[PDB]
Design a protein around this ligand. Sequence first.
Ligand code: HEM
Length: 456
Amino acid sequence: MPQPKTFGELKNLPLLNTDKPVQALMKIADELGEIFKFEAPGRVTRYLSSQRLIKEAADESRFDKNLSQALKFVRDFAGDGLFTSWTHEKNWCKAHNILLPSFSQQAMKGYHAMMVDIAVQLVQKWERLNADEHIEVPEDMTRLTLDTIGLSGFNYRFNSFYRDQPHPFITSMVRALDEAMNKLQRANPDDPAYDENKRQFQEDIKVMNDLVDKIIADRKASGEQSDDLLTHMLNGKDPETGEPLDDENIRYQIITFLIAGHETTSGLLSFALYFLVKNPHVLQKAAEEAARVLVDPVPSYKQVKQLKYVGMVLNEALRLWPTAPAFSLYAKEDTVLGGEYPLEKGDELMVLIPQLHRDKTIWGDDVEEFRPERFENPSAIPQHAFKPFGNGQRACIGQQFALHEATLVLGMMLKHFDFEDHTNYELDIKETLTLKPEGFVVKAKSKKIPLGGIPS
Ligand code: HEM
Protein backbone atom coordinates (compact mmCIF):
# COMPACT_ATOMS: atom_id res chain seq x y z
CA MET A 1 0.00 0.00 0.00
CA PRO A 2 1.27 3.44 -0.99
CA GLN A 3 1.62 6.24 1.58
CA PRO A 4 2.54 9.89 0.91
CA LYS A 5 5.54 11.74 2.34
CA THR A 6 5.95 11.83 6.10
CA PHE A 7 7.51 14.21 8.58
CA GLY A 8 8.94 12.34 11.58
CA GLU A 9 6.38 11.94 14.39
CA LEU A 10 3.88 14.17 12.61
CA LYS A 11 3.69 11.47 9.89
CA ASN A 12 1.29 12.65 7.12
CA LEU A 13 -0.45 15.37 9.22
CA PRO A 14 1.40 18.41 7.69
CA LEU A 15 -0.14 17.54 4.27
CA LEU A 16 -3.51 18.67 5.65
CA ASN A 17 -1.98 21.92 6.89
CA THR A 18 -3.60 23.83 4.06
CA ASP A 19 -6.85 25.72 3.42
CA LYS A 20 -7.85 23.08 0.85
CA PRO A 21 -7.24 19.65 2.38
CA VAL A 22 -9.70 17.76 0.16
CA GLN A 23 -8.00 19.14 -2.94
CA ALA A 24 -4.61 18.20 -1.47
CA LEU A 25 -5.90 14.65 -0.98
CA MET A 26 -7.14 14.53 -4.62
CA LYS A 27 -3.61 15.37 -5.84
CA ILE A 28 -2.25 12.64 -3.60
CA ALA A 29 -4.87 10.18 -4.94
CA ASP A 30 -3.84 11.11 -8.50
CA GLU A 31 -0.19 10.33 -7.75
CA LEU A 32 -0.68 7.16 -5.66
CA GLY A 33 -3.82 5.57 -7.13
CA GLU A 34 -6.89 3.84 -5.81
CA ILE A 35 -5.78 3.42 -2.19
CA PHE A 36 -3.31 5.08 0.15
CA LYS A 37 -2.55 5.03 3.84
CA PHE A 38 -2.70 8.29 5.70
CA GLU A 39 -1.20 8.57 9.19
CA ALA A 40 -1.33 11.29 11.83
CA PRO A 41 -0.34 10.92 15.53
CA GLY A 42 -2.86 8.45 17.03
CA ARG A 43 -4.74 8.11 13.70
CA VAL A 44 -4.65 5.99 10.51
CA THR A 45 -6.99 6.09 7.51
CA ARG A 46 -7.11 4.46 4.10
CA TYR A 47 -8.26 6.79 1.32
CA LEU A 48 -10.21 5.11 -1.48
CA SER A 49 -10.62 6.53 -4.99
CA SER A 50 -11.64 3.68 -7.29
CA GLN A 51 -15.11 2.38 -7.99
CA ARG A 52 -13.66 -1.10 -7.65
CA LEU A 53 -12.70 -0.65 -3.99
CA ILE A 54 -15.54 1.72 -3.11
CA LYS A 55 -18.09 -0.87 -4.24
CA GLU A 56 -16.77 -3.22 -1.53
CA ALA A 57 -16.62 -0.43 1.06
CA ALA A 58 -20.32 0.13 0.13
CA ASP A 59 -21.18 -3.36 1.44
CA GLU A 60 -23.11 -2.66 4.66
CA SER A 61 -22.67 -6.10 6.08
CA ARG A 62 -18.88 -5.50 6.03
CA PHE A 63 -18.63 -1.73 6.63
CA ASP A 64 -20.64 0.85 8.55
CA LYS A 65 -20.53 4.67 8.80
CA ASN A 66 -17.69 6.04 10.88
CA LEU A 67 -17.60 9.41 12.58
CA SER A 68 -14.31 10.71 11.34
CA GLN A 69 -12.38 13.06 13.62
CA ALA A 70 -14.17 16.03 12.00
CA LEU A 71 -17.70 14.72 12.49
CA LYS A 72 -16.65 14.08 16.10
CA PHE A 73 -15.88 17.79 16.44
CA VAL A 74 -19.18 18.68 14.72
CA ARG A 75 -20.84 16.35 17.25
CA ASP A 76 -20.08 18.89 20.01
CA PHE A 77 -22.99 20.90 18.58
CA ALA A 78 -24.89 18.36 16.42
CA GLY A 79 -24.89 15.63 19.13
CA ASP A 80 -26.73 12.46 18.21
CA GLY A 81 -28.74 14.01 15.37
CA LEU A 82 -29.09 11.91 12.19
CA PHE A 83 -25.79 13.04 10.64
CA THR A 84 -23.47 12.74 13.62
CA SER A 85 -24.76 9.59 15.30
CA TRP A 86 -23.42 6.04 15.07
CA THR A 87 -25.73 3.61 13.25
CA HIS A 88 -26.45 1.63 16.44
CA GLU A 89 -27.17 4.62 18.73
CA LYS A 90 -30.72 4.56 20.05
CA ASN A 91 -31.53 7.88 18.38
CA TRP A 92 -30.29 7.00 14.87
CA CYS A 93 -32.81 4.23 14.14
CA LYS A 94 -35.47 6.06 16.16
CA ALA A 95 -35.09 9.39 14.31
CA HIS A 96 -34.61 7.74 10.94
CA ASN A 97 -37.85 5.77 11.23
CA ILE A 98 -39.72 8.80 12.60
CA LEU A 99 -38.50 11.29 9.96
CA LEU A 100 -38.15 9.15 6.80
CA PRO A 101 -41.83 9.80 5.90
CA SER A 102 -41.03 13.54 5.96
CA PHE A 103 -39.09 12.93 2.71
CA SER A 104 -41.66 10.93 0.75
CA GLN A 105 -43.24 12.07 -2.54
CA GLN A 106 -46.39 12.96 -0.59
CA ALA A 107 -44.22 15.12 1.71
CA MET A 108 -42.26 16.64 -1.22
CA LYS A 109 -45.54 17.80 -2.86
CA GLY A 110 -46.32 19.48 0.46
CA TYR A 111 -42.98 21.34 0.62
CA HIS A 112 -43.28 22.53 -2.96
CA ALA A 113 -45.28 25.73 -2.28
CA MET A 114 -42.78 26.94 0.32
CA MET A 115 -39.83 26.13 -1.92
CA VAL A 116 -41.57 28.38 -4.48
CA ASP A 117 -41.99 31.20 -1.88
CA ILE A 118 -38.20 31.37 -1.42
CA ALA A 119 -37.38 30.89 -5.11
CA VAL A 120 -39.69 33.81 -5.97
CA GLN A 121 -37.70 35.91 -3.48
CA LEU A 122 -34.45 35.00 -5.24
CA VAL A 123 -35.86 35.81 -8.66
CA GLN A 124 -37.28 39.12 -7.39
CA LYS A 125 -33.89 40.11 -5.92
CA TRP A 126 -32.22 39.57 -9.28
CA GLU A 127 -35.01 41.30 -11.27
CA ARG A 128 -34.58 44.27 -8.86
CA LEU A 129 -30.85 44.75 -9.51
CA ASN A 130 -29.68 47.89 -11.34
CA ALA A 131 -27.61 47.64 -14.56
CA ASP A 132 -24.40 48.52 -12.68
CA GLU A 133 -24.85 45.51 -10.30
CA HIS A 134 -23.87 41.85 -10.21
CA ILE A 135 -24.72 38.65 -8.37
CA GLU A 136 -22.60 37.01 -5.69
CA VAL A 137 -23.64 33.44 -6.55
CA PRO A 138 -22.77 31.29 -3.45
CA GLU A 139 -23.89 34.06 -1.07
CA ASP A 140 -27.35 34.28 -2.73
CA MET A 141 -27.60 30.47 -3.02
CA THR A 142 -27.01 30.20 0.72
CA ARG A 143 -29.72 32.78 1.32
CA LEU A 144 -31.99 30.63 -0.82
CA THR A 145 -31.17 27.20 0.65
CA LEU A 146 -31.11 28.21 4.33
CA ASP A 147 -34.44 29.96 3.84
CA THR A 148 -35.98 26.95 2.04
CA ILE A 149 -35.09 24.41 4.79
CA GLY A 150 -36.15 26.89 7.53
CA LEU A 151 -39.54 27.48 5.89
CA SER A 152 -40.39 24.04 4.41
CA GLY A 153 -39.16 22.18 7.45
CA PHE A 154 -39.78 24.41 10.47
CA ASN A 155 -42.21 27.09 9.28
CA TYR A 156 -39.54 29.58 10.26
CA ARG A 157 -38.37 32.55 8.19
CA PHE A 158 -34.66 33.40 8.34
CA ASN A 159 -35.47 36.27 5.98
CA SER A 160 -32.00 36.00 4.47
CA PHE A 161 -32.95 38.14 1.51
CA TYR A 162 -33.65 41.04 3.94
CA ARG A 163 -29.94 41.08 4.83
CA ASP A 164 -26.95 42.44 2.84
CA GLN A 165 -24.55 40.17 4.78
CA PRO A 166 -24.86 36.48 5.74
CA HIS A 167 -27.47 35.60 8.37
CA PRO A 168 -25.88 35.45 11.87
CA PHE A 169 -26.76 31.73 11.90
CA ILE A 170 -24.59 31.22 8.81
CA THR A 171 -21.73 33.29 10.25
CA SER A 172 -21.61 31.14 13.37
CA MET A 173 -22.08 27.85 11.48
CA VAL A 174 -19.23 28.59 9.10
CA ARG A 175 -16.96 29.64 12.00
CA ALA A 176 -17.95 26.49 13.93
CA LEU A 177 -17.25 24.26 10.90
CA ASP A 178 -14.02 26.10 10.11
CA GLU A 179 -12.86 25.52 13.66
CA ALA A 180 -13.63 21.78 13.34
CA MET A 181 -11.45 21.65 10.19
CA ASN A 182 -8.72 23.55 12.11
CA LYS A 183 -8.64 21.26 15.19
CA LEU A 184 -7.77 18.32 12.89
CA GLN A 185 -4.55 19.97 11.89
CA ARG A 186 -3.44 21.01 15.38
CA ALA A 187 -0.59 18.73 16.43
CA ASN A 188 -0.76 20.53 19.81
CA PRO A 189 -4.59 20.86 20.59
CA ASP A 190 -4.75 21.94 24.27
CA ASP A 191 -2.09 24.71 24.15
CA PRO A 192 -3.34 27.92 25.95
CA ALA A 193 -3.05 29.83 22.62
CA TYR A 194 -6.11 28.02 21.24
CA ASP A 195 -8.26 29.13 24.22
CA GLU A 196 -9.55 32.04 22.10
CA ASN A 197 -10.63 29.54 19.44
CA LYS A 198 -12.47 27.52 22.11
CA ARG A 199 -14.26 30.52 23.63
CA GLN A 200 -15.44 31.60 20.16
CA PHE A 201 -16.49 28.02 19.37
CA GLN A 202 -18.88 27.98 22.35
CA GLU A 203 -20.11 31.43 21.37
CA ASP A 204 -20.94 30.04 17.90
CA ILE A 205 -22.76 27.05 19.39
CA LYS A 206 -24.67 29.53 21.61
CA VAL A 207 -25.76 31.48 18.52
CA MET A 208 -27.02 28.29 16.77
CA ASN A 209 -28.78 27.09 19.92
CA ASP A 210 -30.49 30.45 20.52
CA LEU A 211 -31.95 30.21 17.04
CA VAL A 212 -33.19 26.69 17.71
CA ASP A 213 -34.93 28.09 20.84
CA LYS A 214 -36.80 30.56 18.60
CA ILE A 215 -37.84 27.89 16.09
CA ILE A 216 -39.25 25.79 18.94
CA ALA A 217 -40.86 28.82 20.68
CA ASP A 218 -42.46 30.08 17.41
CA ARG A 219 -43.96 26.63 16.78
CA LYS A 220 -45.26 26.34 20.36
CA ALA A 221 -47.03 29.72 19.93
CA SER A 222 -48.25 29.04 16.35
CA GLY A 223 -52.04 28.56 16.41
CA GLU A 224 -51.95 27.32 12.79
CA GLN A 225 -51.17 23.68 11.82
CA SER A 226 -48.01 23.07 9.75
CA ASP A 227 -47.71 19.29 9.18
CA ASP A 228 -43.96 19.62 8.30
CA LEU A 229 -40.55 18.15 9.28
CA LEU A 230 -40.75 19.76 12.73
CA THR A 231 -44.31 18.46 13.39
CA HIS A 232 -43.03 14.91 12.87
CA MET A 233 -40.01 15.63 15.13
CA LEU A 234 -42.36 16.82 17.89
CA ASN A 235 -45.22 14.31 17.54
CA GLY A 236 -43.91 11.28 15.59
CA LYS A 237 -43.46 7.96 17.34
CA ASP A 238 -40.97 5.20 16.48
CA PRO A 239 -42.85 2.13 15.20
CA GLU A 240 -40.17 -0.22 16.60
CA THR A 241 -39.80 1.33 20.10
CA GLY A 242 -43.17 3.06 20.73
CA GLU A 243 -41.26 6.21 21.82
CA PRO A 244 -41.15 9.78 20.38
CA LEU A 245 -37.84 11.71 20.25
CA ASP A 246 -36.92 13.40 23.51
CA ASP A 247 -36.35 17.18 23.75
CA GLU A 248 -32.54 16.96 23.81
CA ASN A 249 -32.43 14.99 20.54
CA ILE A 250 -35.05 17.19 18.86
CA ARG A 251 -32.70 20.21 19.36
CA TYR A 252 -29.89 18.24 17.76
CA GLN A 253 -32.12 17.28 14.82
CA ILE A 254 -33.02 20.91 14.20
CA ILE A 255 -29.39 22.08 14.18
CA THR A 256 -28.56 19.03 12.03
CA PHE A 257 -31.21 19.70 9.39
CA LEU A 258 -30.59 23.46 9.24
CA ILE A 259 -26.91 22.81 8.45
CA ALA A 260 -27.10 19.56 6.41
CA GLY A 261 -30.34 20.87 4.82
CA HIS A 262 -28.87 23.88 3.03
CA GLU A 263 -25.09 24.16 2.88
CA THR A 264 -24.33 21.44 0.28
CA THR A 265 -27.34 22.41 -1.84
CA SER A 266 -26.00 25.97 -1.90
CA GLY A 267 -22.70 24.56 -3.13
CA LEU A 268 -24.46 22.46 -5.77
CA LEU A 269 -26.47 25.34 -7.26
CA SER A 270 -23.30 27.49 -7.30
CA PHE A 271 -21.31 24.84 -9.14
CA ALA A 272 -24.18 24.12 -11.51
CA LEU A 273 -24.38 27.78 -12.48
CA TYR A 274 -20.60 27.90 -12.72
CA PHE A 275 -20.65 25.01 -15.19
CA LEU A 276 -23.57 26.47 -17.06
CA VAL A 277 -21.81 29.78 -17.78
CA LYS A 278 -18.57 28.03 -18.80
CA ASN A 279 -20.42 25.74 -21.27
CA PRO A 280 -22.68 27.90 -23.51
CA HIS A 281 -24.34 25.04 -25.49
CA VAL A 282 -25.27 23.31 -22.24
CA LEU A 283 -26.71 26.59 -20.95
CA GLN A 284 -28.77 27.22 -24.09
CA LYS A 285 -29.95 23.60 -23.99
CA ALA A 286 -30.94 23.97 -20.31
CA ALA A 287 -32.61 27.36 -20.95
CA GLU A 288 -34.56 25.91 -23.90
CA GLU A 289 -35.93 23.18 -21.57
CA ALA A 290 -36.84 25.64 -18.84
CA ALA A 291 -38.77 27.81 -21.34
CA ARG A 292 -40.41 24.78 -22.93
CA VAL A 293 -41.52 23.16 -19.63
CA LEU A 294 -42.24 26.13 -17.33
CA VAL A 295 -45.38 27.47 -19.06
CA ASP A 296 -47.35 28.66 -15.99
CA PRO A 297 -46.48 31.76 -13.99
CA VAL A 298 -45.04 29.65 -11.12
CA PRO A 299 -43.78 26.05 -11.39
CA SER A 300 -45.92 23.16 -10.27
CA TYR A 301 -44.46 20.03 -8.72
CA LYS A 302 -45.02 17.87 -11.86
CA GLN A 303 -43.24 20.43 -14.03
CA VAL A 304 -40.08 20.28 -11.90
CA LYS A 305 -40.05 16.48 -12.39
CA GLN A 306 -40.12 17.19 -16.14
CA LEU A 307 -36.94 19.27 -16.04
CA LYS A 308 -34.96 16.25 -17.14
CA TYR A 309 -31.99 18.06 -18.67
CA VAL A 310 -31.73 20.39 -15.66
CA GLY A 311 -31.53 17.21 -13.49
CA MET A 312 -28.70 16.01 -15.72
CA VAL A 313 -26.82 19.31 -15.34
CA LEU A 314 -27.21 19.04 -11.57
CA ASN A 315 -25.98 15.44 -11.57
CA GLU A 316 -22.99 16.28 -13.72
CA ALA A 317 -22.11 19.12 -11.28
CA LEU A 318 -22.30 16.69 -8.34
CA ARG A 319 -20.08 14.41 -10.39
CA LEU A 320 -17.21 16.90 -10.77
CA TRP A 321 -17.62 18.71 -7.43
CA PRO A 322 -19.69 16.74 -4.96
CA THR A 323 -20.29 19.31 -2.23
CA ALA A 324 -19.87 16.84 0.63
CA PRO A 325 -16.66 15.45 -0.81
CA ALA A 326 -15.95 12.65 1.68
CA PHE A 327 -17.49 10.03 3.93
CA SER A 328 -15.92 7.67 6.41
CA LEU A 329 -16.43 3.94 7.06
CA TYR A 330 -15.07 1.35 9.50
CA ALA A 331 -14.59 -2.40 9.11
CA LYS A 332 -17.16 -4.28 11.20
CA GLU A 333 -14.95 -7.39 11.23
CA ASP A 334 -11.46 -8.41 10.13
CA THR A 335 -11.73 -8.44 6.32
CA VAL A 336 -9.67 -8.18 3.10
CA LEU A 337 -10.36 -5.37 0.65
CA GLY A 338 -10.33 -6.23 -3.06
CA GLY A 339 -8.64 -9.52 -2.21
CA GLU A 340 -5.44 -7.53 -1.58
CA TYR A 341 -5.69 -5.11 1.39
CA PRO A 342 -6.23 -6.65 4.84
CA LEU A 343 -8.21 -4.62 7.36
CA GLU A 344 -8.70 -5.25 11.04
CA LYS A 345 -12.01 -4.75 12.82
CA GLY A 346 -12.46 -1.02 13.27
CA ASP A 347 -10.00 0.13 10.57
CA GLU A 348 -11.10 3.39 8.93
CA LEU A 349 -11.73 4.02 5.22
CA MET A 350 -12.29 7.44 3.67
CA VAL A 351 -14.27 7.52 0.46
CA LEU A 352 -12.81 10.37 -1.55
CA ILE A 353 -15.83 11.23 -3.68
CA PRO A 354 -14.38 13.67 -6.24
CA GLN A 355 -11.77 11.01 -7.10
CA LEU A 356 -14.34 8.23 -7.26
CA HIS A 357 -16.12 10.45 -9.82
CA ARG A 358 -12.94 10.89 -11.88
CA ASP A 359 -12.22 7.10 -12.17
CA LYS A 360 -11.43 6.88 -15.86
CA THR A 361 -12.01 3.11 -15.91
CA ILE A 362 -15.72 3.92 -15.27
CA TRP A 363 -16.48 7.26 -16.91
CA GLY A 364 -13.91 7.36 -19.68
CA ASP A 365 -10.74 9.38 -20.28
CA ASP A 366 -12.79 12.54 -20.61
CA VAL A 367 -13.66 12.69 -16.83
CA GLU A 368 -12.68 16.38 -16.57
CA GLU A 369 -15.15 17.55 -19.26
CA PHE A 370 -18.56 18.83 -18.17
CA ARG A 371 -21.05 16.58 -20.04
CA PRO A 372 -24.62 16.27 -18.71
CA GLU A 373 -25.34 13.69 -21.42
CA ARG A 374 -23.55 11.05 -19.25
CA PHE A 375 -26.77 11.09 -17.21
CA GLU A 376 -29.23 10.60 -20.10
CA ASN A 377 -29.82 6.96 -19.12
CA PRO A 378 -29.19 6.85 -15.32
CA SER A 379 -29.28 3.01 -15.17
CA ALA A 380 -26.36 2.92 -17.67
CA ILE A 381 -24.14 4.07 -14.77
CA PRO A 382 -22.64 1.22 -12.72
CA GLN A 383 -23.61 0.76 -9.09
CA HIS A 384 -21.38 2.76 -6.71
CA ALA A 385 -19.76 4.75 -9.54
CA PHE A 386 -21.70 7.79 -8.45
CA LYS A 387 -22.15 8.54 -4.77
CA PRO A 388 -22.62 12.28 -4.00
CA PHE A 389 -25.25 11.31 -1.41
CA GLY A 390 -23.26 8.68 0.48
CA ASN A 391 -24.21 5.06 0.95
CA GLY A 392 -26.88 2.59 2.04
CA GLN A 393 -29.02 3.21 5.10
CA ARG A 394 -26.71 6.08 6.11
CA ALA A 395 -27.23 7.77 2.70
CA CYS A 396 -28.58 11.33 2.52
CA ILE A 397 -32.18 11.41 3.74
CA GLY A 398 -32.65 14.79 1.98
CA GLN A 399 -31.55 13.69 -1.48
CA GLN A 400 -34.92 14.22 -3.24
CA PHE A 401 -35.49 17.42 -1.23
CA ALA A 402 -32.15 18.87 -2.43
CA LEU A 403 -32.62 17.84 -6.06
CA HIS A 404 -36.21 19.04 -6.18
CA GLU A 405 -35.18 22.39 -4.66
CA ALA A 406 -32.15 22.75 -6.98
CA THR A 407 -34.16 21.75 -10.09
CA LEU A 408 -37.01 24.14 -9.31
CA VAL A 409 -34.62 27.02 -8.63
CA LEU A 410 -32.27 26.46 -11.54
CA GLY A 411 -35.32 26.05 -13.84
CA MET A 412 -36.75 29.41 -12.74
CA MET A 413 -33.35 31.04 -13.04
CA LEU A 414 -32.94 29.77 -16.60
CA LYS A 415 -36.50 30.80 -17.48
CA HIS A 416 -36.07 34.37 -16.22
CA PHE A 417 -32.49 35.52 -16.98
CA ASP A 418 -29.58 35.34 -19.37
CA PHE A 419 -26.34 34.89 -17.48
CA GLU A 420 -22.98 36.40 -18.18
CA ASP A 421 -19.56 35.33 -16.88
CA HIS A 422 -18.42 38.98 -17.00
CA THR A 423 -15.17 38.62 -14.99
CA ASN A 424 -14.24 35.41 -16.80
CA TYR A 425 -14.33 33.78 -13.36
CA GLU A 426 -11.38 31.61 -12.38
CA LEU A 427 -12.50 28.50 -10.44
CA ASP A 428 -11.35 28.81 -6.84
CA ILE A 429 -12.85 26.15 -4.59
CA LYS A 430 -13.25 26.99 -0.89
CA GLU A 431 -13.33 24.23 1.72
CA THR A 432 -15.27 24.25 4.98
CA LEU A 433 -15.65 20.47 5.19
CA THR A 434 -17.99 21.19 2.29
CA LEU A 435 -17.08 22.75 -1.08
CA LYS A 436 -18.23 25.94 -2.82
CA PRO A 437 -16.63 28.06 -5.59
CA GLU A 438 -15.47 31.18 -3.75
CA GLY A 439 -16.03 34.62 -5.27
CA PHE A 440 -18.12 33.27 -8.17
CA VAL A 441 -19.97 36.30 -9.65
CA VAL A 442 -22.26 36.67 -12.67
CA LYS A 443 -24.55 39.24 -14.29
CA ALA A 444 -28.15 38.35 -14.91
CA LYS A 445 -29.98 40.22 -17.64
CA SER A 446 -33.72 39.78 -17.09
CA LYS A 447 -35.69 38.13 -19.91
CA LYS A 448 -38.56 40.24 -18.49
CA ILE A 449 -41.04 37.38 -18.13
CA PRO A 450 -43.76 38.10 -15.51
CA LEU A 451 -43.59 36.11 -12.26
CA GLY A 452 -46.71 34.66 -10.64
CA GLY A 453 -47.71 35.22 -7.03
CA ILE A 454 -46.74 32.77 -4.29
CA PRO A 455 -49.23 29.81 -3.92
CA SER A 456 -51.01 29.24 -0.51
C1 HEM B 1 -27.00 18.28 -2.98
C2 HEM B 1 -27.00 18.50 -1.66
C3 HEM B 1 -26.62 17.38 -0.65
C4 HEM B 1 -25.52 16.60 -0.66
C5 HEM B 1 -24.37 16.61 -1.71
C6 HEM B 1 -25.58 15.75 0.51
C7 HEM B 1 -24.66 14.79 0.88
C8 HEM B 1 -24.77 13.90 1.95
C9 HEM B 1 -23.86 12.82 2.28
C10 HEM B 1 -22.56 12.49 1.52
C11 HEM B 1 -24.32 12.19 3.36
C12 HEM B 1 -23.66 10.99 4.08
C13 HEM B 1 -22.70 11.48 5.15
C14 HEM B 1 -21.73 10.40 5.60
O1 HEM B 1 -21.79 9.23 5.14
O2 HEM B 1 -20.87 10.70 6.45
C15 HEM B 1 -25.55 12.85 3.76
C16 HEM B 1 -26.37 12.51 4.83
C17 HEM B 1 -27.40 13.27 5.36
N1 HEM B 1 -28.07 14.34 4.74
FE1 HEM B 1 -27.45 15.16 2.93
N2 HEM B 1 -26.75 16.03 1.19
C18 HEM B 1 -27.41 17.05 0.52
C19 HEM B 1 -28.62 17.61 0.89
C20 HEM B 1 -29.33 17.41 2.06
C21 HEM B 1 -30.56 18.06 2.45
C22 HEM B 1 -31.32 19.10 1.58
C23 HEM B 1 -30.90 17.58 3.66
C24 HEM B 1 -32.11 17.92 4.54
C25 HEM B 1 -33.23 18.45 4.03
C26 HEM B 1 -29.91 16.63 4.06
C27 HEM B 1 -29.88 15.93 5.25
C28 HEM B 1 -29.06 14.87 5.57
C29 HEM B 1 -29.09 14.11 6.82
C30 HEM B 1 -30.01 14.31 8.04
C31 HEM B 1 -28.00 13.05 6.67
C32 HEM B 1 -27.65 11.96 7.68
C33 HEM B 1 -28.52 10.77 7.23
C34 HEM B 1 -28.40 9.59 8.19
O3 HEM B 1 -27.27 9.16 8.49
O4 HEM B 1 -29.44 9.05 8.66
N3 HEM B 1 -28.98 16.53 3.06
N4 HEM B 1 -25.81 13.86 2.85
